[PDB]
């Protein structure tokens, strides 16, 4: 009860802290700086300093798929669905689908009156990858959202729950991380999610305590790649006595 | 596709899981068994018989 | 020595000597050509 309110007021104070001082972090008193900041580096420039994308990939990146060229794969798949007529059920046919292994809980939803639809996926849309999607905050909602909390995503005929990661939308090679979704400009939320070919609409919903869904952000799917990289910045302080 | 008539057959009633038959008009393109079927509330599956 | 305390055990052979010379205040000092290719 009150511990959720205290954590929410801590979220509000973090918004005040991270906006005036952008990414400033105090020096740890007891922990050695070489241990806490071991996997860190400094760059001379913020726009033109090179960075290896293949460097230091954790165990999570071994569970997802990769594309040698996403643009050519998207063009190849879209060409063969417009040109080739695969031998199957044609449009306008009243067909019936025998689907293999579904729970019975699908059926009682239909008996209650909830509409049930289905759609055949394209090739390589069932596999896992990293989604990049552009969002913009609804003016009608004012509650701030943090970087790594659970949110409900409606992304191209699909609904799923995941925690995003907000980064600045910039034409540069690397994007600075944004901790809180500012309600004036477009940001990018990166989600471990199934592959969905663009264009596809993106809606974000925050689950209220009383079961309500409040619309937060709207936009589209930008690209499907894990090569996009997010950089978190740290400012240390020192006094020239 | 939109489900017009839905009926169920359970493979095992204690397993609560079985084959589902959904009937509706094909809408977008040519629907084929060689790609998966996604129900919007229940994830990916496989059809077997059309 | 200015940094730490040196524990010295006074043997009977150190009678005429001072105490400062058994705690040394300094550390010893401890101290690839071009060939043209074209």
């Amino acid at each position: 009860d009150e511990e959720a309110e205290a954590k929410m007021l801590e979220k509000y104070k973090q918004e005040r802290l991270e906006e005036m001082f952008p990414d400033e972090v105090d020096t740890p008193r007891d922990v050695a700086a070489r241990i806490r900041f071991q996997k860190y580096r400094g760059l001379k420039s913020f726009r033109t300093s090179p960075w290896d994308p293949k460097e230091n990939l954790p165990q999570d990146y071994a569970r997802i798929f990769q594309f040698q060229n996403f643009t050519n794969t998207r063009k190849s798949i879209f060409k063969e669905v417009e040109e080739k007529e695969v031998e199957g059920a044609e449009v306008g046919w009243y067909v019936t689908l025998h689907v293999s292994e579904v729970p019975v809980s699908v059926v009682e939803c239909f008996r209650q009156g909830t509409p049930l639809i289905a759609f055949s996926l394209l090739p390589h849309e069932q596999k896992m990858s990293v989604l990049n999607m552009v969002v913009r905050r609804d003016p009608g909602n004012t509650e701030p959202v943090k970087a790594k909390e659970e949110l409900i995503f409606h992304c191209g005929f699909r609904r799923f729950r995941a925690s995003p990661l907000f980064s600045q939308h910039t034409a540069a090679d690397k994007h600075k991380l944004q901790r809180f979704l500012t309600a004036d400009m477009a940001l990018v939320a990166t989600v471990y999610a199934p592959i969905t070919f663009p264009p596809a609409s993106v809606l974000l919903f925050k689950q209220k305590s009383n079961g309500m869904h409040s619309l937060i952000a709207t936009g589209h799917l930008m690209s499907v790649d894990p090569d996009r990289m997010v950089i978190k910045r740290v400012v240390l302080s020192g006094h020239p006595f | 596709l939109f489900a017009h008539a839905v009926d169920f057959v359970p493979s095992e009633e204690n397993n609560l899981v079985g084959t589902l038959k959904i009937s509706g008009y094909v809408r977008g393109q040519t629907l084929n068994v060689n790609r998966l079927l996604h129900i919007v509330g229940y994830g990916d599956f496989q059809m077997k018989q059309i | 020595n200015g940094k730490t305390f040196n524990q010295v055990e006074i043997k009977p052979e150190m009678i005429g000597h001072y105490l400062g010379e058994f705690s040394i205040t300094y550390k010893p000092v401890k101290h690839s050509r071009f060939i043209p290719l074209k």
């Binding site: 569970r63 997802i64 | 998966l36 | 020595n1 040196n6 550390k27």
Partner: peptide, 22 residues
């Protein structure tokens, strides 16, 4: 027919001497 593989199927110093004089 494609499968439902969203995840990859493949898995000599004395006792009283200080460290300075050592």
């Amino acid at each position: 027919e494609s499968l439902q593989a969203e995840v990859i199927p493949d898995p000599k110093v004395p006792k009283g001497t200080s460290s300075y004089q050592a």
